[PDB]
Amino acid sequence: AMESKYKEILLLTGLDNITDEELDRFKGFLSDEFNIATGKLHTANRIQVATLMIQNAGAVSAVMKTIRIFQKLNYMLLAKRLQEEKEKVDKQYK
């Protein structure tokens, strides 16, 4: 489904591409996009973080907000890649 595919984008192309240090920075920005308490994320791994994001906002919005946070964090290479993969999945359901 479009949902599962968006999640694969978020997790494999997004979070699995950033270092543990960068994941900490990602978590520090997460509350600015999601109504998820910062304390809830602190020891969460990538799969847990992606899942909580999607539970809160839905898959499409989760990917969009991830892209936005990568931009705020100056991870411009990855933000472009996520945007490309997003468009690729969108085409499949247009």
Amino acid in position 22: E
Angstrom distance (rounded) from CA 3 to CA 15: 17
Contacts of 36 (CB under 8 A, 6+ apart): 30, 52, 53, 56
Q: Are 13 and 82 in contact (CB under 8 A)?
A: yes
- Can you give the resolution of this entry in Å? 1.8
Breaks following residues of the chain (C-to-N distance > 2.5 Å): none
Angstrom distance (rounded) from CA 68 to CA 88: 18
Q: How was this structure determined?
A: X-ray
Class of domain 1-94: mainly alpha
DSSP 34: S
Q: Residue 71: which region, alpha, beta or left (left: phi > 0; alpha: psi -120 to 50)?
A: alpha
